Amino acid sequence: EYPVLQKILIGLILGAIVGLILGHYGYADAVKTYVKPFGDLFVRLLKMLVMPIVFASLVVGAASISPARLGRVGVKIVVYYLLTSAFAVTLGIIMARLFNPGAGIHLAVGGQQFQPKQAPPLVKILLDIVPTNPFGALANGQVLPTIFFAIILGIAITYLMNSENEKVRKSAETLLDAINGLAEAMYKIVNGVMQYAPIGVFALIAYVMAEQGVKVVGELAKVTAAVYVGLTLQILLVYFVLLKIYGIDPISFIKKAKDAMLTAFVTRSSSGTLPVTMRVAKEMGISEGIYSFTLPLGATINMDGTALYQGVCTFFIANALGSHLTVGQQLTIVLTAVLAIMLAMVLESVGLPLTDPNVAAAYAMILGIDAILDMGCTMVNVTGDLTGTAIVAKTE
């Protein structure tokens, strides 16, 4: 029972208090063994739905809209995603210079060491979008390859709804219907899973705050302000701005996106949030044609929030090492950060690799409050996707 958009807010506020307090008294362990499992059951239940929903929804949606309309949606959302992600870095740099995170600090070296995994060739990453076995792609995670096949099937069904034959048209009928059955059924499930969300949300930040809340002091606090005040501006100064521009109401969009935003914040999984991010798209009544393609692709490609975190970390490390960056170095961040634990790749691009003993001991502090910084980031990550879909949907 009870209005559930409040139960979540109650759980979230009450969770932060029960969190920060328990952990400060040394119950960092206690929370992990007792409370966290309830927060995990929530995450599990959401991940459960991702594969059926993304696939099933997209076959229907791609079979619903024109193969021309879809491409135009595609090119629009990508142009949108890159520009928002670029804007988010330059806004993070502005925060990292507005604040001075780790400016005066001279930290303890040689404690921790790192070796980043070197990223796979671009050619191989693009070819891998085309899956060599659909049932394989579905079986093990793999959002992007699934997206591809779902559209290739979506378009295939539509061309069968036209055949000069009756029995051909009658089979493509039932298949596209059955797939929709699943898509309908899956959305229905999230409505029930969101019922357990209060308990999950409470439990989930109860853990984040107990484990890493206490570590948010000193220079490791100034970075947190830098990230959050920056993330706030990505919402007000970039989304609210582009929503007004495109004839949408910012306030009633935030009203409708409330669930996807808090799941994304609590869960830290842009991907694990997808069923909720997607339901909220259907809630505000965006075309299944558009949102079933833009949101799963954006769950992977559009990370405005994270792109900001990468900007404000590249400045934390630079300040702690004790050498500032110029116009030619700062712009080298923005490009690499768009093109990109993968912060390890935008750190070599400026000239301070992660293997470097003192760089590595500085990054060790940052990774120490990561789950705190990553809540805010994942929310703005996900919000950025809904904003893009809403804009592309307005222009069809």
DSSP states of 57-103 as a string?
Answer: HHHHHHHHS-HHHHHHHHHHHHHHHHHHHHHHHHHHHHHHHHS-TTS
Residues 252-281: x/- map of binding to Na ion (CB under 5 A)?
A: ------------------x-----------
Please say which residue, 136 or 218, places its beta carbon nearer to its own copies.
Answer: 136
Residue for token digits 């925060």? 95
| Residue 268 counted as an annotated binding residue | yes
Applying the rule CB under 5 A, the residues between 291 and 350 that interact with Na ion are: 299, 302-303
Residue 233's identity, in one-letter code, is: L
Residue for token digits 């004790």? 322
Return the SS3 of 118.
coil
Using only the alpha carbons of the chain, give its radius of gyration: 22
How far is CA 2 from each of CA 10, 109, 137, 263, rounded to the nearest angstrom? 12, 53, 39, 18
CB of residue 76 to Na ion, shortest distance in Å: 17
Handedness of CA 295, 301, 304, 310 (dihedral sign): positive
Residue 381: which of its own copies, Na ion, none does it interact with, CB under 5 to 8 A by kind?
Na ion
Please say which residue, 180 or 302, places its beta carbon nearer to Na ion.
Answer: 302
Residue 96's identity, in one-letter code, is: A
Residue 270: which of its own copies, Na ion, none does it interact with, CB under 5 to 8 A by kind?
Na ion
Q: How many helices (H) and strands (E) does the chain have?
A: 18, 0
For the chain, the 3-state helix, strand and coil shares in percent, each to the nearest 5, are 80, 0, 20
Q: Which of 381, 383, 387, 389 binds Na ion (CB under 5 A)?
A: 381
CB of residue 36 to its own copies, shortest distance in Å: 9
Footprint of its own copies on this chain (CB under 8 A)? 33, 37, 40-41, 44-45, 47-48, 50-52, 123, 126-127, 130-136, 138-141, 149, 152-153, 156-157, 159-160, 163, 168, 170-178, 180-182, 184-186, 188-189
Q: What's the number of CA atoms in the CB half-sphere (13 Å) around residue 361?
A: 11
Please say which residue, 74 or 134, places its beta carbon nearer to its own copies.
Answer: 134
CB of residue 33 to its own copies, shortest distance in Å: 8
CB of residue 271 to Na ion, shortest distance in Å: 8
Residues 214-253: x/- map of binding to Na ion (CB under 5 A)?
A: ----------------------------------------
The tokens for 329 are 């170095």
Known binding residues for L-aspartate: 268-270, 306, 374, 381
Using CB under 5 A as the criterion, which residues of the chain lie in contact with Na ion when the complex forms?
270, 299, 302-303, 381
